[PDB]
Amino acid sequence: EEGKLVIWINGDKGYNGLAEVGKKFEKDTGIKVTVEHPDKLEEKFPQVAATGDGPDIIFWAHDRFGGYAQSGLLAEITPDKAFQDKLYPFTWDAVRYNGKLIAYPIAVEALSLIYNKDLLPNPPKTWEEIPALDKELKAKGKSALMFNLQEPYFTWPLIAADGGYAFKYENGKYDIKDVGVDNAGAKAGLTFLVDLIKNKHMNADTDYSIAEAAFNKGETAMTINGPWAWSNIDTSKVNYGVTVLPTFKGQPSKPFVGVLSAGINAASPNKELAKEFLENYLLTDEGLEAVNKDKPLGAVALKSYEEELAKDPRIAATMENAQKGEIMPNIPQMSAFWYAVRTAVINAASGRQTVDEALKDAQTNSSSVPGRGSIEGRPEFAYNPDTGEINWDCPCLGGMAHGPCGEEFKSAFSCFVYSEAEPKGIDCVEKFQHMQDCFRKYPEHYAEQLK
Template identity: 30%
Template sequence: MRIRSAGVAAAVALALAAAGCGGGEEPNTTESPRAAGGKLVIWADDKRTAALKPFAEKFGQANGVTVEVQAVANDVLQTTFVTASQQGSGPDIVVGAHDWIGNLVQNGAIDPVQLSATQKNAFHPTALKAVTFSGQTYGVPYAMENLALIRNTQLAPEAPRTIEELVATGKRLKADKKVSEVLCLQVGQNGDAYHIYPLYSSAGGTLFGTTPEGDYDPKNLGVGTPESIAAFRKIAALGEKGEGVLKRSITAENSISLFTGKKCAFLVSGPWAISDVKKAGLAYDVTPVPGFAGAGPARPFVGVQAFYVAAKGQNKAVAQEFAANYVSTPELAVALYQADPRPPALTAALDQLMGTDPDLAKFLDAGKDGAVLPAIPAMAAVWDPFGKAEAAIIGGADPAATLTSAGKTIAGQIK
């Protein structure tokens, strides 16, 4: 475990000891939080841990419980939580991405959160949809995120309406030696399904079809279909053997720094890039990722960060109280925004912050045509084969053969 908290080893040991001594009984859910007492353990990543601690302490004082907020490295938070849950040594609440839900539910790691209709209406509809799985609300959303086009307005004063307009502007700037790259969109050697999806969707590609209820259908795979191959032919035309706009040399590690270093006028990224852009002192604007001319809109994935109640937590009544009635306060939502500026899911907090951060409304506008990132377990089978197929096609591989092979790989893993 890469848990960065001095007291975590002791906390895990205590939880294991309690489980071994019959402490695994669920608390009486009819008790009030104060009556339940005890300890509430919350796991989150570093940024959110720092923001949560003062609010957690306030909640603990008001409800007669000891609250511990412990930091777990974000890249192992989900797997660490599932493993700890199975061992009976996990937290009462975990904070993470909404696309974990399918896996967490499949592993019996989280419970539905009890939100009233009034509480649900307080959240952005897309955020609430993202945390709804099989008809139940499994998390309390607090932040949303999606990709947008971040543009250096000194180099490119006008927002491109299509990807073709962007390419023309970028090529002109490159010919004038004002930039070295037409577009900074991370690909890397293994591809990046998340960042290529806006262009893929604009060209008619999908990952999954949907059920009559509007849920993603893992039995209706969109990778390897004629539509997906046609979409990647358009992407290939922008690749290394085509326009040279999409490159494997542009990666997660250098895409933002290339933009802040004025090596490109256009960056496809999310709210997490803005702090670096501001530090660089660039004049910038945020607009939707443009789609292909004559095709559909570019539909970025919309992701949501949320609080989850552990199914095997030691203090489930208090965890439900914290998640349902405390996470939904504007004060906490604003504090989490200040720790990591992404549009709040709580409408009241979003309205409060829009006056001081105009980028919030711009990112929301960029995601208005977005697709909720699939949270079904089958999505885990998509990322690697799809990304590698993307990288290969951008490098010059045949779209039809590459996508057909990727589709077979994904289908085999889903079965």
């Protein structure tokens, strides 16, 4: 465990090409480096991290790192002043959580509209002309676009285009009370997506694989994917191009911009070797190229690499989108935001719910939830995860189970303590709300609302 490195990275990125860096390391350090690509590792990491085996180093987009940093799951990083100049200021900004760097930035990624020349020589400038493009081209399975409708990352650029946003960026810090998924604009974005599924232009259950496989084969004129896709489309031998995303209601489409980042685990026996690896083998030109060859990272964080590769019109298109869109927050609430919007988009797309109804929930689930203080922490001792029983008389509950709002507290607590959702308890929002709403009838009783 102490003798070697086990790195984690998502299935879509170039893990073999990283394995090539790992072997290059092994050679002149005598330190084996294993690359693994599990499923749902962004969620898997905080599980195993505190509960035994986690990896030495973890790759993900920066948005999740603030959460892990808050949970104390990451070693603070120590790249000297000299090394910091090798990478763009703004990429460093993406991995700072409360004035301390928490990961290395690798590459900056935003998804783009992917042409299909030979099918569509002149890509649609706007969104709203899509329905009249799929209808101009249909007699086989001659469809115009197929993108992942299972992940909110892909649907979001639409929802954001006309005024949708996650957390408002006000006064140099993101305000977790200002959520824009309920607004006129988001509501419009989603109505369109729903009107594509309604008018049979898309299928509500289109996976990443379903979308890629259908495009690669040559069925769809367009897809929406990021830089890690290109590599499989070269293989496809499909005459493709990469460009600005269509403009919904005239306003630009706004992709949430990801910065691939590499965190060292707070519980990594080998924290000194991890630095060596990342700083001195990966974040080198010969290092980043090894990966990039395998699955294109996008635009990299390395200055000394980037400008000699800004000619490449796909990178330039990626970057155009990146600048139209907005950089993701790293703050812990992001975990919840994604949950909120994933449920919301999917619940709409299936008719399960109306746009209004859906995004109504989305807004509340994204928002801060009161009475957490009464539930998280010491009170959780009342729950022994072996039997699954709860002692409602545990003094750790601070008497809360009995009293005018006892029944309500029991609802919220048990909910959160049983919650298997990610993030923990995100499914218990209504009940926490109800419980706080109850506390209000008896304010002389519950100074649980002193802030």
